[PDB]
Ligand SMILES: O=C(NO)N[C@@H](Cc1ccccc1)C(=O)O
């Protein structure tokens with residue numbers, strides 16, 4: 001097992017548009033290990049999500065993993081989901097405000113997000129999934145996709 | 159073994175300074191798998207070297223692997239060397255000029271002046287320190303790959 005260094009605000013890797021994962025990488029040891037290192041890194045830093053660019057990997061892979069922990073004591077439980085090449089298909093016009101932080105901005109803020117999102121993605125095995133999130137998990141999906149598109153949560157404030 | 163997508167000139171991932179590999183990564187299955195995918199990619203594309211930023215991984219890992227192949231039919235053959243956190247500690251004042259291509263630059267080769275000899279200190283995948291002297295075409299490969307780690311493409315070194 002490994003815990004990967006996390007890039008911080010100011011580093012240009014967080015400003016890129018991450019590249020999609022290729023068909024060759026689906027169901028590979030390489031991809032399972034990337035996802036495992038990400039997962040371990042998120043857990044060690046009490047994150048509730050992580051995106052590959054945060055660990056210097058400019059690829060479209062995120063994890064969404066709400067759980068109560070010291071950084072988010074009230075966060076709801078979910079089974080962690082690894083999403084390859086996620087795309088938000090629909091954002092609700094209805095919005096919610098919530099406090100976010102970021103492993104890459106060690107500073108928190110209050111951000112407006114869609115209350116609901118519908119997201120398409122591939123599993124690590126290559127299966128195409130479409131699914132709806134609400135509330136805090138929806139916020140995490142939006143924050144992590146933003147990371148894939150070179151956007152930090154501070155740029156969504158004001 | 160997986161063959162990975164390769165970034166091309168224009169893509170901003172190739173302009174960054176790649177981050178050093180951290181101590182906890184040394185001798186990790188993570189780092190072994192990265193190197194294996196790099197190596198497979200390089201062989202599948204007939205490269206004689208590869209840098210992690212070329213496969214969208216902004217970390218300081220390179221492979222130097224001169225061998226004759228369809229892209230470089232007269233290259234000398236060496237045993238492939240994977241280098242973690244390579245640092246060039248000496249460049250010779252003597253220069254050689256040679257035609258270089260790049261996995262990241264399609265449809266172009268150019269004449270590039272390189273030091274004829276470089277001394278490079280690096281870590282193995284297990285994390286052991288090694289210092290090696292390279293000459294000639296292997297030396298040009300080391301220099302090209304270290305330039306990839308520093309956000310530089312060979313086109314920026316011409317004339
Ligand atoms: O930086 C990351 N993700 O990029 N981790 C965030 C995820 C997050 C997203 C939205 C709201 C709250 C929290 C964190 O502080 O755990």
Ligand SMILES: O=C(NO)N[C@@H](Cc1ccccc1)C(=O)O
Pocket residue numbers: 204205206207208209212229257258259260261262298299302303306
């Ligand atoms: O683009 C890469 N490496 O980044 N590979 C180059 C390596 C290289 C370096 C120097 C001289 C000739 C060839 C290639 O065309 O195989």
Ligand SMILES: [Zn+2]
Pocket residue numbers: 101102103104143147
């Ligand atoms: Zn974040």
Ligand SMILES: [Zn+2]
Pocket residue numbers: 259260261262302306
């Ligand atoms: Zn190159």
